[PDB]
Symmetry: D3
Subunit: 97 residues, 6 copies
């Protein structure tokens, strides 16, 4: 029963590259340093150039709660706090079989 | 690489939960076993909402998603759920940032 | 000038698709034939979700919409759908932008 | 007949309300003047949220909508709003009943 | 200082009275037996007769987490599990005083 | 008894979080002190999204809410936030079940 978390962010038009870099920093840092993290993808909406999505998967819920208290997500929020709208959690869920 | 991502949402009546879960798993396995362009297909149930499910799909490109929409696995899937399910609601379609 | 737009959303069970379409067409035809301030009333079905419908309504002004909300057609429309339909969900109310 | 309906939503900063309204009106006028398959194109402002706009578009079929997405008018429209607008968010695509 | 949680449910048309009684049971039992539960309101949508909301207020986030673990909410879900759609959490947040 | 409840949502830029909170507090306090039909008015910050706020409003009935919409407190509130805020988005309005 993996734990899935889908997050959504909106950023101003002049901060598209800035957020993409911060999102990729969150992804690579979480994958390189947190054993509970199985997948971390950064996705851009196909039509809305200001809207991004984070598709995250963890071993269980405890691994996500650990991620929320680790250093990588703290630096990610330090990078984007001055412009980004979000997070909006589209869902949290468990994988079916 | 720059993969194509599709996120879908469904709601079902309370008495159809594992019926939908079974239908989604047949869709996932049939798609993976028959569609080289379909790269991922996960069935997810909301952690709190008992009646809500999500489908996390990844494709080679947009053309592979369109092919999936015309293949017979998806057609069987809708024949299973059409009498009770609410959806699909497409949360998003998008491209992976590398 | 500056017409009033109302977009409404409904969901129905799979076995009530024909019933709601008939009720929605009753609301549209009854409103367009009996209410002078009603300029347009369309029934639309989602291209992928066969259980979801939208009502695209346009009125003379806001006052014409308030009148429609108090008239006989909308009351009978809700009588026809109450036993099965989910809604309404108002997507928006707004004003036409003019040059 | 069975027309094809597209509803789109945009948000803009408080100081860009007139800029987007002019851009949407150009999109509407240019589409009506040049696209026979484009049957309607209205620009609507939310009654309470002055930063939110909607585009109510009608086409004779889905092919006509796809041609509109490829034509010059929408390309110029997106050049105008790219520096500030949030969107598009597609509220729905659907087919007229009767 | 208070912690606010807004919840949304949908029910079939023939279950409106049943859900109202279940929601009232949840509210009264929670308010009477949970000191951290300060306010708990059952609200019906003005237009959508099938849609209900729960407006809950707690002393802090820990009081809400304990509420989720207690017996009143478990009995609430036993009453509604056979028909209700939800819960959909509209938001959770903190009051600005 | 059957009070009337109104839930509202706003988004503001990252540098206007304190300005909007002060404006919402002015709206809340001015309305509660001066409008007998206004029974409750709460400003709520989202627990995760620092740019998103909500207003939880309770009234005697729908007439009392409509009167609030026509009064001076809300008019000054919108003057304070017009240059930056996104909204209002009315989540719902409804009646308390007793």
């Amino acid at each position: 029963m993996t734990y899935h978390v889908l997050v959504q962010f909106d950023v101003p038009s002049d901060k598209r590259e800035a957020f993409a870099a911060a999102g990729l920093f969150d992804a690579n840092g979480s994958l390189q340093n947190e054993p509970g993290t199985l997948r971390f993808e950064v996705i851009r909406d196909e039509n809305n150039r200001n809207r991004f999505y984070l598709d995250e998967v963890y071993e269980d819920e405890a691994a996500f709660l650990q991620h929320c208290r680790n250093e990588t997500i703290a630096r990610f929020y330090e990078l984007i706090d001055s412009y980004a709208f979000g997070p909006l959690f589209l869902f949290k869920g468990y994988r079916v079989e």
